[PDB]
Amino acid sequence: SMKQPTAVIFDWYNTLIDTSINIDRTTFYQVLDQMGYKNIDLDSIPNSTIPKYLITLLGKRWKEATILYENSLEKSQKSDNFMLNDGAIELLDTLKENNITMAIVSNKNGERLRSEIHHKNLTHYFDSIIGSGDTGTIKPSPEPVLAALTNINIEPSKEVFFIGDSISDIQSAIEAGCLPIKYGSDILSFKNFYDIRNFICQLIN
CATH class of the missing domain: 3.40.50.1000 (HAD superfamily/HAD-like)
Incomplete structure (x- = not known):
């Protein structure tokens, strides 16, 4: 059947x-910005560590971050990697x-x-x-x-x-x-x- x-x-x-692999920092800066965060520096964080780092930063707000993030990627004029x-x-x-x-x-x-x-x-x-x-x-x-x-x-x-x-x-x-x-x-x-x-x-x- x-x-x-x-x-x-x-x-x-x-x-x-x-x-989550090769996250564009510019995009996530905008998300963190929208979410009120300052002054987050991701520039020295290795790309592969970015996700675990953000998970611990955001805590309860992680799911909201992933929603904003997908929303932003869908509307982007920028190229993905x-x-x-x-x-x-x-x-x-x-x-x-x-x-x-x-x-x-x-x-x-x-x-x-x-x-x-x-x-x-x-x-x-x-x-x-x-x-x-x-x-x-x-x-x-x-x-x-x-x-x-x-x-x-x-x-x-x-x-x-x-x-x-x-x-x-x-x-x-x-x-x-x-x-x-x-x-x-x-x-x-x-x-x-x-x-x-x-x-x-x-x-x-």
Whole structure:
């Protein structure tokens, strides 16, 4: 009764992309600024230590910081230097080799989203890339999901897997008639892309 997916939709930030490695300090300065902090100097802190350092600085306000941070990245005109999460390329490549159509649905600005995807040489994997400004609404509306599916010519169903980290991703998937898979930390959930790849390979074979 469980079938291989007819399409796989991915979110970008905090699903495919790890936003905690190569944090742009300028962006986090603005967040800390908005949050009232002064006079935080991150300039001498090694990039790899920045996240643990910020976690201890922010304490209870850490979750709020991550919200502001993602919000800022979505609207940015600046280029990212982020790395993909572990196993992401292996999964994309497995799906491509098996001829399973893929798309991205993100609340990042569509134009900058497409530029970042092309900067990482990943455009060829995706038959539709939908960001904010590409439709009349954003997630958790189903509209951006339905837009990707219109553009890849696949009907919405529970064989369309929407891999996403957020509640808005899950809700958009459900409202669109598609199957949410929660990535990260009633619904299929996986902590990494190696396990998701094994699961999909097991469904295919």
